[PDB]
Amino acid sequence: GSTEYKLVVVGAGDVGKSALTIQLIQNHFVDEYDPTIEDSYRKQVVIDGETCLLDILDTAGQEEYSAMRDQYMRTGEGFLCVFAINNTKSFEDIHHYREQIKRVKDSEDVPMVLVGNKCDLPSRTVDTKQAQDLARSYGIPFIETSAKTRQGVDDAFYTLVREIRKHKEK
Ligand SMILES: C=C1CN2CCC[C@@]2(COc2nc(N3CCN(C(=O)/C=C/c4cc(CN(C)C)c(C)cn4)C[C@@H]3C)c3cc(Cl)c(-c4nc(N)cc(C)c4C(F)(F)F)c(F)c3n2)C1
Numbered sequence: 001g002s003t004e005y006k007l008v009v010v011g012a013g014d015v016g017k018s019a020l021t022i023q024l025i026q027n028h029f030v031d032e033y034d035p036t037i038e039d040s041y042r043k044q045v046v047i048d049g050e051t052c053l054l055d056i057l058d059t060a061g062q063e064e065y066s067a068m069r070d071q072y073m074r075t076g077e078g079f080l081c082v083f084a085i086n087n088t089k090s091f092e093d094i095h096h097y098r099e100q101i102k103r104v105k106d107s108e109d110v111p112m113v114l115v116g117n118k119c120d121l122p123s124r125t126v127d128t129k130q131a132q133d134l135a136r137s138y139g140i141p142f143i144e145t146s147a148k149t150r151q152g153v154d155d156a157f158y159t160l161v162r163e164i165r166k167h168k169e170k
């Protein structure tokens with residue numbers, strides 16, 4: 001059978017969670033996606049020879065800390081922590097997402113990838129070194145992406161799958 005990987009895309013509003021997801025799923029860049037639509041999308045993919053079923057949760061809606069919401073988010077096996085490279089606030093929010101994920105997974109060792117999205121844009125306010133340094137602080141990979149050009153998109157999600165595989169071998 002296919003191994004299913006439950007991947008969760010998190011990050012501040014407008015960083016490109018939906019656009020990254022749709023690029024992975026539909027191979028198309030979406031200029032506009034309703035920011036209140038949270039949905040899960042599936043795609044069968046081959047990663048390192050293995051046929052995988054990716055289940056991608058594109059998070060949306062008001063932040064909510066309830067048992068129900070935590071229970072749901074806790075089903076994620078790996079998390080893309082997305083900021084936009086032209087939005088310093090979205091970068092400064094990353095530790096909040098990291099902290100919430102560690103909380104609901106009750107683990108310091110959750111499969112995670114730091115994603116700096118919108119690298120196609122000229123107006124970057126978060127330089128690569130600071131983002132690499134934050135990923136190093138967390139012990140996780142850092143991948144620069146563009147949902148618009150597809151730069152890094154496969155790498156971001158596939159790296160997350162490889163992280164989950166490695167974690168499950170403990
Ligand atoms: C430091 C902080 C704490 N918050 C207070 C200040 C802000 C902050 C948010 O903080 C914050 N915002 C979350 N929003 C709201 C904002 N977004 C959006 O795309 C909304 C975009 C948007 C865009 C537009 C259009 N524009 C152009 C304007 C409009 C009109 C409206 N909306 C992302 C996500 C759904 C959020 C979502 C989730 Cl699921 C979780 C979460 N909850 C759990 N229970 C457990 C876990 C393990 C998580 C985690 F996995 F995700 F981690 C959080 F933790 C979250 N925290 C960041």
Ligand SMILES: Nc1nc2c(ncn2[C@@H]2O[C@H](COP(=O)(O)OP(=O)(O)O)[C@@H](O)[C@H]2O)c(=O)[nH]1
Binds near residue numbers: 019030033118120121
């Ligand atoms: N130029 C560029 N724009 C992007 C990229 N990713 C997302 N966007 C745009 O940023 C806006 C918000 O993207 P969206 O996926 O809705 O962000 P979300 O709130 O995190 O789901 C939309 O206009 C997208 O077209 C990217 O890699 N490059």
Ligand SMILES: [Mg+2]
Binds near residue numbers: 036058060
């Ligand atoms: Mg969205």
